[PDB]
Design a protein around this nucleic acid. Structure first.
Ligand code: GTP
Ligand code: MG
Ligand code: MG
Lengths: 360, 553, 283, 86, 100, 38, 29
RNA sequence: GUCGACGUACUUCAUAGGAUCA
RNA sequence: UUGUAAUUGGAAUGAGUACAAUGUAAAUACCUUAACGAGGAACAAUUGGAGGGCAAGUCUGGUGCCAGCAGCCG
């Protein structure tokens, strides 16, 4: 009757994958042993968001809150506003909406309100220059995330408008069996309610680490001040390494806490960016789950994506098992014929998914 | 210009395709059975005294045919054969002429995806004059051309001797089938289906006696798979026409019971390196990932935390800083930006390919370009499947068409086992996720032109959506110049009208046909195809509204 | 004055500017503000330089009581005279009379804009876009191409402007080069000026002019003076040595017999390096 | 021959309007997109997305009219003498 | 008609051979895809451009080797003048005296 | 049921806010359209 | 209250339709 | 690259004049 | 003295059916011909174009009761 899961691990993914598959699921024993058991405030909010963009879905939260029954309906989208609790930033809620937006009866036009950055969730730039570019490669031609106002922690106060105008039957079959060549490094260093000197110093730090490279480095300085700057001081940097030949991008992001040296943050994100590149083959680790999910829901054909062995970590394994539990799909991994590197080709057969919600 | 068409995908497997289903459909007494016996004798040189259910016969070196005699007096059968038959041998009584059943089947086939149709006229020996015989043939042929197409082949059979048709015409008919090619149809190339060859009940008889005959049964169905590959894992939802929706408890492939001669020769060829009729009814990381017993952390260490944290795990800042003091080990990824001159040129050529190779990297027509992209992807499928092992291939793609498989269903109603007639075909069809959901279906529907009476709102109508047949109460509406959805009392006499009904959902563009009467007792003499339409939208609610007027003085 | 009325070309200009949401735009020649409203729609904030106070007031009235009102800033004055703020992009429909200065000002801004979309008259734009060996290749082309890269966006005709002008127009894209190439602007321009008096003659013939010899001799004497070497300063003391130096450099560079209009950037750089080697500095 | 992409005037309020009879078709030979007329909205019911349509020469700017859909004449369908095969 | 494209040239190779021979005799007096051609042209232009860039970089480096200020040097703008006023003469005299 | 005429507008707090912001905007620049003596 | 809502609602439906008609007619010509 | 020239195919703007009557 | 007939009278005939004969290498057909074969002569001529009129019906616009679109839907 119900495919049963355990714990709060991959809460968003399991709900999203259930919605795409249409298979009812049950998530039980959610933080049973904790002092405060059951769903968190932000988890409930995400469920509210899922209900807004869908019709016919049925959600039951147990009395103690440690069990969730989710019977998905059709994705319908539409225009709506969502208030994100301070516990999580907007990026926590925007990221799952990317998975569902391109296969909706009506365009997603959602205004997310709350904190716009955090230490553990996707930033505004990470979605704009890191994830939607992956979506565009898969057939989502037009999609935008407008930053009406930035809200830094703890008080937040930001506003972002997500618009996904493209509606597609399914993602195109992926065929990427090479290591993309990085052509240039870009980035955005933003700050709120503070002097411009911080953004300059962050750019100075990142440029020191990246100077030895052989590609151009140009980091944007986006200093926000005034009414649109939010309610608290904050500053963060996002660096993206761009491969113009095939439109692939690798990114690393982080934000600064009060009293931290801006230069150190710039250096750290630059160092992290290089770590991601060394560990990545076609897509970064943080972009990998989106790529795999989109391949699973393509046409009934064999899509190939090159992945480095460094990307096959605990997170990758759990993702595949959840996909197999819901979709019964198995990712076949074969070594590459080359010897210079130890990359592997992840071949995924699509399930024949199609966007039936859209009217003709 | 006439070569151009809408590009589509043909899912027929490159190797070992399933037999083509040949349905012999016609009114009672036209000679369906005697046609099958004559055809079977020609291809196999043996006469079948009695035929029941599908019969698979070898028709060539690498070609097989599955003959199925549709019950002439059932309309439900005629619907579901029409949804699976690759070829339809349309029997027409030449002396009598066309009948309603012949016309009823064609209309069903036209709305559900027209298959190959061959008209076969019998009883021509009953004519007494050669002149009137030619006139009937000319009238019969031209009427047949309107339904199917202009210039369609129509075969003429004179008389039955020893329960067999004349040898010459059967030879002509046999060759015509052999060189035939079949179009790619949208429905059949998107869903997995199978015509059951034999039927077996696996219920332990002890359970039959302890609990009684009323207990639900476990049944095994054997037959060739068609259409898209069927997934290997159990739990797949399938709909058996005229029974209901079930789940695949178990599935496992068997040796082909009617191997084509080319296949046996190839198999015996391997034996060196180291029957024509079948009518039964008559530490690798990949493995470690999918061992759920082994914890993911345990897996990682053997061959060498959660997605809530979007930012991936990184080493400490100081350790990363030392690791990336020098940029080496990633210089390959980044663009470079008397004998050495050649080395420079080779570098520059490589740089040029990266920078502008994609822009520069032809077929005459846009149609051929699309067919090139489709064929390339089918090529890539074949290469990968050859690379993976047979056990891995079955795990990934599932059981491809042409496979002879055993499928076991649990909780099957006992009436199916008890009231089992081999004459009536058993058609199983896979269901996509949308077929599972129930809800309101918005469609464009029109009364069939030959149907005498117009349809009424909230009047039962038997709809044929996908693999499924069911009765519902539709509400015929109108757009009111695209302002509101106004309830109509009846369908328009000679035009379309929007219709809303509750039933199992299906993808848009799915055509359907509707009937009011399926029982033979109430058939009467009129046309039984009452409505035709195409589903436009699927939804959980609808806002039909009706005009209400208040009257005063 | 000439005012554009075609909306398609304005939309194309603003689009091809490729304004990022974090870009500050310098918009010269605001006029009524058909471009300004759209630039405001997709920019961080707009700084406008207007000469006519009436037109600035009308623009302010148009933008009053709108969500983009706080974004706009208007500077009043002459564009050349004003000292301008930092701007990332330039989008100008300014009167053509200041076309040539504008360009070089954009080139010599302390932080030059990464991209600029400028409308000029067809002849001026083609001279900007001219390649070596072309008929219209001129000093402007060489200088701008050394300091930037100019490409053609579109051809704007006469009918679009009311009242119709007597000259056709075109929109071009100017992309200043970052980092700035390391050559003194004065010396580059001086060499070009000496060699482009008649671009279809031999470069030697360009250096035959008596006043050119006088200037080069005075420059040579000044160069010797700066190096603490003692120089006579008579009018004709160093004429014969400078003549020989010019002859030798022209001969060895093989550029004596090459027309200036057919010489590319590298040829002039080679000549400049040779003259610096032998000791002649132009400006 | 062409592929019916979308019915642009399907939503227009005024019945049997000139706009209502236009269909956006993609020419198969070269892939260029063009506009074609339908004789009347009654015929527009037969035409739906993703059918092969045979176009012939004919709101200015529309120079083509549909004569066959799915290999069957529209006039035959409009006169209730044939069924569209799918 | 002599050298027109044939449906299957491979199936009539011998025929093709004759044609070639004929051409070689007929046109003896003279002898005595779009994408591919454009790709060759752009490749040639690209390699030429890169070589020019390297040369330019070397020359600019050597120019930095030889660099001075330009305040005292007389600009080439004076080429047209050909005669100076007493104000200009006085300015030049003062400048030279400052130089010493 | 259809309505024949425009409904009587209601002065809600938002309407008053917009009106007074309008007046403040107009008076800030002294934009008064008043009769001028001839 | 409902009367005001309908007029406001019908206003948006008409405005979108007229704009959405305009885009279609522009594309065809 | 909303690049230039050419070739090809189209679109478009320039139609009213005399006599009588009110 | 004009038009309209599911009005009406008894005469004519072949499309078709068919003994037969002729035809033909044998046949089919044609030409002949016993016997059948007509009122809705339902033994049921077609392909295009133009113009209407009807409502407790629908949509759009506004110097009221109107105009345009159109109307298989009341
Ligand atoms: N004279 C003549 N009789 C025929 C012809 N075709 C069939 N028949 C006769 O028709 C009768 C029925 O033939 P069948 O083969 O049973 O036809 P069927 O399709 O099986 O009929 P059902 O099974 O009852 O649905 C037999 O007696 C045949 O001899 C024909 O061309 N001429
Ligand atoms: Mg039978
Ligand atoms: Mg005859």
């Amino acid at each position: 009757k119900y495919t049963t899961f355990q714990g709060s691990q991959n809460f968003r993914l399991r709900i999203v994958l259930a919605t795409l598959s249409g298979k009812p699921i049950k998530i039980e024993k959610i933080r049973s042993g904790d002092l405060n058991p059951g769903l968190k405030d932000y988890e409930v909010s995400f469920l509210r968001l899922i209900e807004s963009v869908t019709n016919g879905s049925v959600i039951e939260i147990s009395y103690t809150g440690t069990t969730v029954i989710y019977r998905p309906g059709i994705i319908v989208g539409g225009a709506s506003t969502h208030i994100c609790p301070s516990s999580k930033p907007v990026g926590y809620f925007v990221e799952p909406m990317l998975y569902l937006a391109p296969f909706s009866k009506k365009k997603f036009s959602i205004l997310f309100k709350g904190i716009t950055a955090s230490h553990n969730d996707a930033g505004i730039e990470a979605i704009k220059w890191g994830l939607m570019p992956v979506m565009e490669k898969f057939g989502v031609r037009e999609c935008a995330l407008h930053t009406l106002k930035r809200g830094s922690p703890p008080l937040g106060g930001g506003e972002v408008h997500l618009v996904v105008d493209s509606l597609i039957a399914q993602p195109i079959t992926m065929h990427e069996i090479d290591r993309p060549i990085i052509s240039s490094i870009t980035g955005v260093a933003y700050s709120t309610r503070v002097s411009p000197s911080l953004v300059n110093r962050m750019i100075d730090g990142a440029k020191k680490v990246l100077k030895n490279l052989q590609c151009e480095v140009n980091i944007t300085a986006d200093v926000w001040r005034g009414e649109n700057s939010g309610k608290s001081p904050g500053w963060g940097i996002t660096l993206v390494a761009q491969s113009k030949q095939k439109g692939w991008s690798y990114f690393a992001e982080d934000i600064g806490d009060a009293g931290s040296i801006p230069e150190e943050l710039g250096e750290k994100v630059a160092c992290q960016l290089l770590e991601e590149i060394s560990k990545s083959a076609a897509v970064g680790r943080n972009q990998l789950p989106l790529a795999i999910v989109y391949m699973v829901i393509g046409k009934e054909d064999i899509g190939r994506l090159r992945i480095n062995k460094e990307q096959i970590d605990e997170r990758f394994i759990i993702l595949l098992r959840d996909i197999k539990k819901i979709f019964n799909t198995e990712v076949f991994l074969k070594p590459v014929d080359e010897a210079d590197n130890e990359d592997m080709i992840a071949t995924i057969k699509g399930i024949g998914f199609t966007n039936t919600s859209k009217k003709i | 210009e006439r070569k151009l068409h809408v590009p589509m995908v043909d899912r027929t497997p490159e190797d070992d395709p399933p037999p083509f289903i040949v349905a012999v459909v016609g009114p009672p007494g036209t000679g369906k059975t005697t046609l099958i016996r004559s055809l079977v004798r020609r291809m196999t040189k043996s006469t079948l005294n009695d035929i029941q259910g599908p019969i698979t016969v070898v028709s060539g070196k690498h070609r097989r045919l599955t003959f199925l005699e549709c019950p002439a007096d059932d309309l439900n059968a005629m619907i579901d054969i029409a949804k699976i038959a690759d070829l339809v041998l349309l029997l027409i009584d030449g002396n009598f002429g066309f009948e309603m059943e012949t016309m009823e089947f064609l209309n069903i086939a036209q709305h559900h995806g027209m298959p190959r149709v061959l008209g076969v006229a019998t009883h021509l020996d009953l004519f007494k004059s050669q002149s009137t015989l030619r006139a009937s043939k000319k009238r019969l042929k031209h009427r047949f051309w309107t339904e199917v197409y202009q210039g369609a082949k129509l075969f003429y059979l004179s008389g039955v001797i020893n329960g067999r048709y004349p040898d010459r015409e059967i030879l002509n008919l046999s060759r015509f089938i052999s060189v035939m090619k079949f179009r790619p149809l949208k429905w059949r190339n998107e869903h997995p289906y199978m015509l059951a060859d034999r039927f077996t009940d696996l219920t332990h008889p002890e359970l039959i006696e302890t609990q009684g005959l009323q207990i639900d049964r476990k049944v095994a169905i054997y037959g060739y798979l068609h259409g898209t590959p069927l997934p290997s894992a159990p739990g797949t939802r399938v709909h058996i026409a005229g029974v209901g929706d079930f789940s695949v408890a178990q599935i496992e492939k068997l040796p082909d019971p009617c191997p084509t001669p080319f296949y046996q020769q190839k198999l015996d060829d391997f034996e060196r390196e180291k029957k024509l009729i079948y009518a039964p009814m008559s530490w690798n990381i990949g493995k470690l990932i999918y061992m759920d017993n082994i914890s993911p952390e345990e897996c990682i260490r053997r061959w060498r935390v959660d997605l809530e944290k979007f930012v991936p795990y990184f080493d400490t800042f100081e350790k990363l800083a030392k690791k990336w003091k020098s940029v080496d080990a990633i210089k390959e990824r980044f663009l470079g930006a008397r004998e050495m001159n050649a080395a420079k040129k080779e570098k520059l050529r490589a740089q040029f390919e990266i920078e502008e190779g994609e822009n520069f990297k032809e077929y005459d027509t846009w149609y051929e370009l699309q067919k090139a992209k489709i064929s390339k992807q089918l090529e890539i499928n074949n290469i990968e499947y050859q690379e993976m092992t047979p056990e891995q291939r079955q795990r990934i793609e599932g059981f491809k068409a042409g496979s002879y498989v055993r499928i076991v269903f649990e909780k099957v109603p006992m009436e199916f086992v008890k009231n089992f007639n081999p004459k009536f075909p058993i058609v199983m069809g896979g269901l996509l996720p949308t077929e599972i959901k129930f809800g309101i279906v918005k469609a464009r529907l029109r009364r069939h032109r030959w149907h005498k009476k117009i349809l009424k709102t909230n009047d039962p109508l038997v709809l044929s959506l996908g693999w499924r047949r069911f009765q519902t109460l539709p509400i015929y509406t109108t757009t009111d110049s695209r302002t509101r959805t106004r309830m109509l009392k009846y369908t328009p006499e000679h035009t379309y009208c929007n219709a809303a009904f509750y039933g199992p959902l299906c993808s848009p563009n799915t055509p359907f046909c509707g009937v009011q009467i399926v029982a033979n007792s109430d058939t009467g003499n009129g046309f039984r195809i009452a409505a035709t339409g195409i589903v436009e939208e699927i939804d959980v609610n609808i806002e039909i509204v009706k005009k209400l007027k208040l009257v005063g003085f | 004055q000439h005012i554009l009325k075609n909306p398609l070309v304005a939309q194309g200009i603003v689009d091809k500017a490729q304004i990022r949401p974090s870009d500050v735009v310098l918009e010269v020649g605001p006029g009524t503000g058909n471009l300004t409203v759209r630039i405001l729609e997709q920019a961080k904030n707009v700084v406008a330089v207007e000469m006519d106070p009436r037109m600035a007031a009308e623009l302010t009235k148009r933008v009053r009581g709108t969500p983009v009102e706080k974004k706009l800033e208007i500077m009043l004055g002459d564009f050349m005279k004003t000292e301008l703020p930092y701007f990332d992009i330039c989008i100008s429909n300014t009167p053509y009379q200041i076309s040539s200065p504008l360009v070089f000002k954009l080139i010599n801004q302390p932080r030059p804009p990464r991209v600029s979309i400028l409308m000029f008259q067809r002849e001026f734009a083609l001279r900007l876009l001219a390649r070596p060996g072309d008929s219209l290749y001129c000093r402007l082309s060489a200088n701008v191409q050394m300091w930037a890269n100019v490409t053609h966006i579109m051809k704007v005709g006469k009918n679009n402007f009311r009242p119709p002008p007597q000259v056709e127009s075109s929109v071009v894209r100017l992309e200043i080069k970052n980092p700035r190439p390391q050559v003194d602007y004065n010396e580059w321009d001086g060499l070009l000026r000496i060699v482009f008096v008649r671009k279809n003659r031999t470069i030697s013939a360009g250096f035959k002019s008596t006043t050119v010899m006088d200037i080069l001799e005075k420059n040579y004497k000044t160069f010797l003076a700066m190096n603490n070497e003692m120089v006579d300063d008579t009018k004709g003391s160093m004429h014969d040595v400078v003549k020989e130096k010019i002859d030798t450099v022209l001969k060895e560079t093989d550029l004596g017999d090459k027309r200036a209009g057919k010489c590319d950037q590298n040829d002039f750089l080679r000549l400049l390096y040779a003259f610096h080697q032998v000791g002649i500095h132009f400006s | 021959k062409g592929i019916v992409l979308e019915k642009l005037g399907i939503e227009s309020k005024q019945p049997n309007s000139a706009i209502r009879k236009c269909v956006r078709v993609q020419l198969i030979k070269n892939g260029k997109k063009v506009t074609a007329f339908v004789p009347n909205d009654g015929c527009l019911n037969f035409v739906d997305e993703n059918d092969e349509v045979l176009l012939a020469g004919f709101i200015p700017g529309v120079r083509f009219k549909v004569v066959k859909v799915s290999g069957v004449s529209l006039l035959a369908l409009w006169k209730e003498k044939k069924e569209k095969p799918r | 008609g002599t050298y027109r494209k044939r449906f299957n040239e491979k199936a009539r190779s011998g025929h093709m051979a004759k044609l070639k021979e004929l051409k070689r005799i007929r046109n003896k007096q003279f002898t005595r895809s779009k994408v591919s051609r454009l790709k060759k042209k752009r490749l040639d232009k690209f390699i030429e451009h890169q070589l020019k860039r390297e040369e330019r970089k070397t020359i600019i480096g050597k120019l930095q080797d030889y660099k001075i200020d330009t305040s005292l040097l007389t600009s080439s703008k004076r080429l047209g003048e050909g005669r100076q006023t007493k104000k200009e003469e006085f300015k030049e005299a003062l400048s030279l005296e400052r130089q010493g | 049921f259809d309505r024949t005429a425009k409904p009587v507008p209601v002065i809600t707090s938002e309407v008053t806010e917009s009106l007074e912001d309008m007046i403040r905007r107009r008076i800030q620049d002294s934009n008064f359209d008043d009769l001028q003596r001839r | 209250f409902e009367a005001r809502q309908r007029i406001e609602e019908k206003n948006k439906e008409s405005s979108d339709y007229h704009a959405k008609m305009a885009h279609i007619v522009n594309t065809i010509n």
